[PDB]
Amino acid sequence: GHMEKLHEANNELQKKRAIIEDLEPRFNNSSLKIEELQEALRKKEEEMKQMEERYKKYLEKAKSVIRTLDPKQN
Amino acid sequence: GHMEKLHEANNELQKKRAIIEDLEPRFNNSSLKIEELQEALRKKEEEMKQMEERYKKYLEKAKSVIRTLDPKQNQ
């Protein structure tokens, strides 16, 4: 047949059309997601570096409170 | 005539085939990516939980000291 091969071809085109319309919004969503997961990851890793700044500075501060309050040197 | 319609259709098929063949591995990679990231991020919110627990620890030693040396508690 010839008429019958046009039918098989047009239907497969409708099939691929449906495959594409379903997968595209999915792939777009998942792209957005990867971006926000990395802004969260970056923003968290920054918080962690600050958190280490503070505890570090705290320990150094208490190092000098010890000197100030020690009688054996003051 | 009919020749041309079956040629236009078969070549549109190869177009859509190319679209799909290119997007599908991309979408698979990105599904794996989302879950690798979400893992890294929860291993990181954990590391943070430990570090805030450690800093809150130290911040309550510190006010313990601010209270004992409070002039008002020494009179």
Swiss-Prot record, chain B:
Subcellular location: Cytoplasm, Cytoskeleton; Golgi apparatus
Organism superkingdom: Eukaryota
Subunit relationships: Self-associates. Component of the FTS/Hook/FHIP complex (FHF complex), composed of AKTIP/FTS, FHIP1B, and one or more members of the Hook family of proteins HOOK1, HOOK2, and HOOK3. May interact directly with AKTIP/FTS, HOOK1 and HOOK2. Associates with several subunits of the homotypic vesicular sorting complex (the HOPS complex) including VPS16 and VPS41; these interactions may be indirect. Interacts with MSR1, and this association is stimulated by ligand binding to MSR1. Interacts with microtubules. (Microbial infection) Interacts with Salmonella typhimurium spiC.
Family under the similarity heading: Belongs to the hook family.
Function per UniProt: Acts as an adapter protein linking the dynein motor complex to various cargos and converts dynein from a non-processive to a highly processive motor in the presence of dynactin. Facilitates the interaction between dynein and dynactin and activates dynein processivity (the ability to move along a microtubule for a long distance without falling off the track). Predominantly recruits 2 dyneins, which increases both the force and speed of the microtubule motor. Component of the FTS/Hook/FHIP complex (FHF complex).
Protein name, entry field: Protein Hook homolog 3
Organism: Homo sapiens
Range covered out of full length: 553 to 624 of 718
